[PDB]
Amino acid sequence: SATQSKPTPVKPNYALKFTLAGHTKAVSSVKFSPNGEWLASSSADKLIKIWGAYDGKFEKTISGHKLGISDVAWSSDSNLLVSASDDKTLKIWDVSSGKCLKTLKGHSNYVFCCNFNPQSNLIVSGSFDESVRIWDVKTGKCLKTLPAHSDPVSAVHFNRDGSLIVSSSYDGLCRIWDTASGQCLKTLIDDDNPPVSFVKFSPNGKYILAATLDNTLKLWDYSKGKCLKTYTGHKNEKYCIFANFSVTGGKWIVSGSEDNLVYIWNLQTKEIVQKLQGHTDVVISTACHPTENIIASAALENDKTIKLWKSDC
Template identity: 25%
Template sequence: MPRPQWHAPWKLMRVISGHLGWVRCVAFEPDNQWFVTGAGDRTLKLWDLASGELKITLTGHISPVRGVVVSDRHPYMFSVGEDKLVKCWDLECNKVIRHYHGHLSGVYCCSLHPTLDVLCTGGRDSSVRVWDIRTKNQIFCLSGHKDTVASLLTQGVDPQIISGSHDSTVKLWDLAAGKAYATLTHHKKGVRALALHPNKYLFASGSADNLKQWKCPEGVFMKNVDQTPYRAVVNCMAVNHDDVMVAGYDNGSIRFMDWKTGYNFHTEQTRVQPGSLEAEAGIFDCCFDKTGTRLITCEADKTIKVWKEDENATPETHPIEWKAVAPGTEKRW
């Protein structure tokens, strides 16, 4: 078994408040100057990354906003919500310029293809819909899931679309043929979180039973990363270039892990802002910025928290407490 790489523990750097509802989603813009959050108060807010100040509030959704993504190639931002709406915002004039109609129920996740002008959305109608950004036409309705599609990934190489669903399966889709070529049935609970490794041809999926790593393109199972000891629901996952994988749970805990070995080198418990209930310690979404040095978490106490590595930590102050476990003998929950 390889020894885990040393990573510095992460600490809370800033708490940003301003939303009036649960903060459900976050996305960074390509130049890393600002980020956008969507919340249960039906608004999208753009925040300055350096200062944490609010730049603008966008209204237009009539139900909670569940997903947001900013294009790397156009001055566009896309948002989806429980009102079945998929909106395209022009960031030069901060207005909605297109709607994509077709979802039969709430839309929970969205993802932009990195090289093609297509947007993928998934929701409670158990389908993944692929839209042409410019013409507003629906290219495909990818059906096959039996329950809500809760998480989506897109990449430039096969599988170009990966979807996770509450039916506890992960599907890999062939975008050219418009159908699934692999269904991964290893999870026992709904898959709410997926994370793509930024520079390896791998991805991870998170469910209440455990986190798993997979190899593209066939979806070959590699390993269980983390046997979740407290049976909490995984709402989000993210990976940065330094092989730090983070998972956010609905009980407010954030676990930082080494990608290669799955070693949990740091666990943080979020604290609710004053005036909130203890039960509102929950993490709905998390995202690393473009440099991988800042982590944003969206939380149930209506706050956005910014985390960074502890610059004072060293391998001596925070040693790796790791013992090798022979494959097949690890504890099963």
């Protein structure tokens, strides 16, 4: 009919815009600055690199760690980074000067995952030493060490007002912690205990998204302790792969995968809605821009690049 019309899209149309080359070993993590202007990348090559978020343009290299870096995270004001290294330290960095303001010492094995609280006066760490640590940003001193898990800590994240920390671990557990006391408020291991490879609060802080090394993502209502959604179809049995809520357009779940693809799911229906092809090794990390429909993806040793993808909604 002459009155037929283009239906409203129910899937994103992410398309490769840029490829960011520079790291000389596997990339470990990519994160967009809260102000949307920058992307930071960590790598096994011991370096952090900064890139323009919209043009993929290399900006600078930040160095000082003596071994490889598994994670990097921005402060709320986009002025600081914290990095987590195999050299058993975290380092706080001034982005504009590239100088290390503080070296956070105390973990007795690889530091694996890192994050500021929303206020950015605290850093939370997770380590292969099975501990979670909470650090004072201004002094660089360890405020609390939590006996968080019985195997390496894979992820660590503050909720939206900083009152809670969620942690994941190869011991199969997700735990929620009271920032103020360090007390454990909840343990989820509702059913079997495959290693929990990643976890993160939902933006509204009422859900947690957790990856397990059985090719599964689960959205949890943690106040109820129930699994609300399950996302399958990707491959994730080995590496600690980042997942994300994409909220700028349609509501998706985004994750890398060990088949070298970026997977995009409809958060509500669990349907795979896009798979992004291009990387030549495991996509270890993805991130979603805070205001625009942009995804960054990063890959391991046989790739070493970051890719920026953009969609129309």
